[PDB]
Design a protein around this ligand. Structure first.
Ligand SMILES: [Ca+2]
Ligand SMILES: [Ca+2]
Lengths: 63, 192
């Protein structure tokens, strides 16, 4: 359950830095239009990027 | 300053290109060829020109871009090189001029430069280009180590005024001589 959550956090962390960025989210989300993709990514960042660094960290993901 | 990663102005592998052959958030033209782990902005053919640029304009007062690339060719000598740019041309380019090699800051005149061999290196070359408080700085990892943080100074211009909004881009070209010009990643940060 915690294992699951961490598994799914790491799934699209392609560079291994333990942070999810919008390009990694774009892969996770995906043919959808670019504006729809932007809307979804911008939504995640607005929901969850509490320190406004452009990354979702594990604390921000798990909430 | 605070750095914020800006996904809309960035690309990278290992899933760089979508199923329809496009790079999300970027346009490409000419002879540029996207692939899953890099964009070959101009290949080692005669008389090529290719470009990739952000579909959106950025409006960042201060910013930093990290670009990782390879320029590879059979010659001890190659051509023509690649340019990293921010432009409304009106803006600034950082020109990696193979045919030298030198790296040149050009505004729109050549403002500053360094001698730096960026071709045929064992690891990717990395350029970190910073625009902060009207100073444009170029730092280069010349491809001899795989340490992403190992940069040597190249050039810097103080008191530079560039457009308040602009596209980021990369361009490359070849002539009679021709290298492969590959960009593995372009990572853009807004600085506050
Ligand atoms: Ca990551
Ligand atoms: Ca964050």
């Amino acid at each position: 359950p915690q294992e699951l959550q961490l598994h799914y956090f790491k799934m699209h962390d392609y560079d291994g830095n333990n942070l999810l960025d919008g390009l990694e989210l774009s892969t996770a989300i995906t043919l959808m239009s670019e504006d729809e993709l932007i809307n979804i990514i911008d939504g995640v960042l607005r929901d969850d990027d509490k320190n406004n660094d452009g990354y979702i960290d594990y604390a921000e993901f798990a909430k | 300053p605070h750095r914020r990663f800006e996904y809309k102005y960035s690309f990278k592998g290992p899933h760089l290109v979508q199923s329809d052959g496009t790079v999300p958030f970027w346009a490409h033209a000419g002879n540029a060829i996207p692939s899953s782990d890099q964009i070959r902005v101009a290949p080692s053919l005669k008389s090529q020109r290719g470009s990739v640029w952000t579909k959106t304009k950025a409006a960042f007062e201060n910013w930093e871009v990290e670009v990782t690339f390879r320029v590879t060719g059979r010659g001890r000598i190659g051509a023509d090189g690649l340019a990293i740019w921010y432009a409304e041309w009106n803006g600034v380019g950082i020109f990696f001029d193979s045919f030298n090699p030198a790296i040149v800051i050009i505004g729109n005149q050549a403002l500053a430069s360094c001698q730096r061999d960026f071709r045929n290196k064992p690891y990717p070359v990395r350029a970190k280009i910073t625009y902060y408080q009207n100073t444009l700085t170029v730092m280069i990892n010349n491809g001899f180590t795989p340490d992403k943080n190992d940069y040597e100074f190249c050039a810097k211009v103080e008191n530079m005024i560039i457009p308040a909004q602009g596209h980021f881009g990369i361009s490359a070209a070849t002539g009679g001589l021709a290298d492969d010009h590959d960009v593995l990643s372009f990572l853009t940060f807004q600085l506050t």
